RNA sequence: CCCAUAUCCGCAGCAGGUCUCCAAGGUGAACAGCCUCUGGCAUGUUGGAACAAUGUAGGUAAGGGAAGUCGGCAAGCCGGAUCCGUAACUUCGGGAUAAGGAUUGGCUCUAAGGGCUGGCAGCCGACUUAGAACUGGUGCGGACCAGGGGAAUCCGACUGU
RNA sequence: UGCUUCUGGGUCGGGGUUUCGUACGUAGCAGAGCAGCUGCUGCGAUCUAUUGAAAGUCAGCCCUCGACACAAGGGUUUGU
């Protein structure tokens with residue numbers, strides 16, 4: 037019910053982010069972002085909690101050469117919360133999911149943003165910690 | 168809102184100041200400003216920086 | 231009391247703030263001369279060659295921030311000049327600038 | 338041929354011409370529509386932009402992610418010392434619009450206000466309103482005044498008051514007061530005049546015009562920025578680095594036909610210093626000024642029900658480039674137009690405020706008073722000294 | 732006498748062209764660049780006040796990293812030296828500084844590397860190399876100087892014009 | 893925007909704020925070691941105390957009313 041607020045978008049189309057799940061992918065290459073209507077000359081961009089379409093560049097041979105739905109769980113670009121806190125992570129990370137938001141893997145490495153955690157209960161259950 | 172303390176200098180951070188840092192290992196740090204943040208990220212020891220709480224406590228300057 | 235002498239501190243730093251490197255010390259000499267007219271109301275200001283030397287002592291761009299100077303209003307001896315008086319600006323070396331007031335000097 | 342890929346035009350054609358405002362003081366283009374059933378009240382006020390800070394508060398927004406939770410919000414501090422009413426002006430509705438009908442000034446007018454009538458106070462003899470003020474001392478002139486007031490009752494339909502600011506209480510260099518007409522909405526026309534006639538030469542605190550949690554409009558002149566190019570003035574795309582003859586330009590300023598440059602194309606010119614009206618700026622706090630009660634100065638106008646520190650709104654070192662706020666102030670959510678020291682016209686809303694955000698009641702938990710002249714990290718000098726310990730100065 | 736950002740040729744006191752000799756200290760491999768002494772000059776056919784736009788020449792940018800564009804154009808990364816290490820292919824010469832790593836300050840010492848005289852003794856010495864401790868907020872080829880790299884296709888052997 | 897209400901702004905000084913990061917000198921039986929004289933004396937990067945020290949801080953930061961002088965001025969026009 038409660039809607040997520042706008043946050044700074046740090047991951048434009050073309051960003052390679054780490055893969056923080058045990059699927060086998062070592063990184064995720066963003067090719068689009070769900071919900072982006074956009075405008076002329078502007079790259080679609082993503083932030084923690086956003087579902088994106090990505091391809092695996094480094095990882096299991098069976099996982100590559102195809103487009104996966106993924107969700108960004110960490111980003112290096114600091115973003116303001118409504119309690120005034122500017123938070124940023126050591127690295128950019130995502131997890132592969134399906135259309136329904138269920139993790140293709142079964143575990144996550146590293147913390148997950150509270151912004152993405154509250155939006156994806158399937159992702160939250162696998163998070164070791166929440167930032 | 169509760170006040171934090173800079174993970175480098177020991178100064179306390181009031182709401183709407185500094186940046187919160189979160190490493191891939193799970194530890195979360197708060198920094199009063201970019202002066203403190205840069206020293207922390209360059210792997211400087213606060214105990215060796217004259218103007219920090221950890222330095223003055225190690226050298227008994229207040230005491 | 232036309233003939234009078236006072237010792238001033240001039241905050242050169244704020245006078246030349248924002249000026250380009252190759253004009254910083256030339257402009258200080260201009261702000262010192264302009265200061266002299268304001269204080270003594272004399273168009274004929276004469277800046278001593280020691281004060282000029284002091285202002286350039288550190289090159290063209292790192293001019294000293296403060297300089298203590300003495301202003302002495304004197305009678306223009308030549309009757310050919312339209313100006314009856316002139317001001318002589320001399321350098322006053324000081325080991326410190328703290329608490330220096332503007333002082334009356336009586337010869 | 339048609340442009341290949343669509344794109345919305347840059348800038349609004351509704352704010353043309355992008356010229357320098359002809360007035361320095363924000364002008365109330367439209368006063369709220371008069372409701373005779375309401376009691377007599379004022380509709381505007383003049384404040385000065387002290388500067389910004391940020392506060393903490395607990396939001397009450399059922400169904401929000403920030404319900405029953407704390408949030409940090411920026412606010413603008415607008416100093417609003419009481420205004421002084423000096424004249425009454427009446428208007429008549431005509432088939433050509435309102436026409437100024439009659440103007441009556443007070444018997445006594447302070448030197449802050451008279452400065453407004455002069456381009457050089459130093460060279461003047463201060464003769465303004467010297468022969469007029471005698472109309473209040475002699476019986477014949479008084480009998481002429483209450484005939485003027487009676488005519489304003491018969492004929493006029495809009496009553497305004499001439500209130501000026503009190504610059505001597507502000508920390509600014511300016512001593513010339515800002516004088517504006519404020520419309521008197523409320524009861525009948527007779528009631529408006531008696532209410533206004535009573536207040537000639539009196540002071541009107543801001544708290545009598547506005548109230549807590551009110552949504553108001555701020556009218557002012559934005560920060561001038563001089564001659565600007567299209568890239569900065571109109572926010573158009575920058576041309577490729579290879580462009581010859583410059584790249585901060587609009588490449589095609591028109592088509593061959595019509596053989597003219599249209600008024601809707603971006604061009605270089607003035608940016609800033611534009612008259613603007615911004616609506617729906619909530620009042621987060623109307624702060625009381627400093628009071629000498631029982632020989633002690635009361636200045637804790639930044640303490641809240643949760644922060645009992647005896648501290649004023651002023652941040653350490655004072656408001657940067659403004660000074661010290663020692664009068665009544667209005668704390669408005671968000672930002673407003675203008676530089677520091679800019680005179681701002683506060684006006685009441687022209688709209689009907691029926692929204693959970695408009696009606697929300699504000700309860701400030703914390704007002705930030707750290708220095709804005711650097712990265713201040715202490716709320717009060719006592720807090721600083723207690724943390725730092727004795728210094729070499731002591 | 733000039734012999735050249737003003738005495739010569741380019742219409743001129745023109746950022747062009749025009750044959751030579753001598754050649755200090757420091758850093759450094761160095762006639763490199765950077766600073767300086769001898770000698771010389773007065774900023775290059777004007778000055779003052781401002782510091783808008785747009786330029787020309789320099790810089791810096793969070794997160795992303797060619798998504799820009801015909802095309803990585805432009806800029807940027809690399810860069811010295813010591814120690815280690817180094818593939819395909821090859822006409823066995825190369826490729827090659829392939830690729831890829833580590834190190835680098837200051838300070839106080841240690842060891843080795845010589846001549847003259849009369850397996851020893853004494854006196855003179857000139858810069859090097861190597862190792863060790865201590866030390867600074869990990870900064871240290873601190874400015875200057877100073878190769879981005881790899882896998883392939885086409886053409887022409889190469890150097891030269 | 894300012895230009896005599898013992899008032900005004902100005903300049904200097906001071907205080908506040910803030911930036912950097914702990915000044916020169918001095919002392920040290922702190923200092924890896926080395927040289928000399930019989931424990932002392934020298935060379936020694938660095939360290940510790942003095943010392944959140946020193947230095948800058950409106951030129952478009954804030955407050956003084958401590959010091960100093962200045963300020964009742966000058967020019968051109970305008971009439972129903």
Ligand SMILES: [Mg+2]
Nearest residue numbers: 076077078342
């Ligand atoms: Mg495009």
Ligand SMILES: [Mg+2]
Nearest residue numbers: 339340342343
């Ligand atoms: Mg169309």
Ligand SMILES: [Mg+2]
Nearest residue numbers: 579580581582
């Ligand atoms: Mg071109």
Ligand SMILES: [Mg+2]
Nearest residue numbers: 709710711712
């Ligand atoms: Mg600030």
Ligand SMILES: [Mg+2]
Nearest residue numbers: 252253774775
């Ligand atoms: Mg030049």
Ligand SMILES: [Mg+2]
Nearest residue numbers: 773774775777
């Ligand atoms: Mg010249």
Ligand SMILES: [Mg+2]
Nearest residue numbers: 736737744775
């Ligand atoms: Mg010439």
Ligand SMILES: [Mg+2]
Nearest residue numbers: 746775776777
């Ligand atoms: Mg020229």
Ligand SMILES: [Mg+2]
Nearest residue numbers: 792793794795
């Ligand atoms: Mg960038």
Ligand SMILES: [Mg+2]
Nearest residue numbers: 112792793794
């Ligand atoms: Mg970056």
Ligand SMILES: [Mg+2]
Nearest residue numbers: 797798799800
């Ligand atoms: Mg492309």
Ligand SMILES: [Mg+2]
Nearest residue numbers: 077798799800
């Ligand atoms: Mg394209």
Ligand SMILES: [Mg+2]
Nearest residue numbers: 803804805806
């Ligand atoms: Mg290139």
Ligand SMILES: [Mg+2]
Nearest residue numbers: 826827829881
């Ligand atoms: Mg090769």
Ligand SMILES: [Mg+2]
Nearest residue numbers: 886887888889
């Ligand atoms: Mg060839």
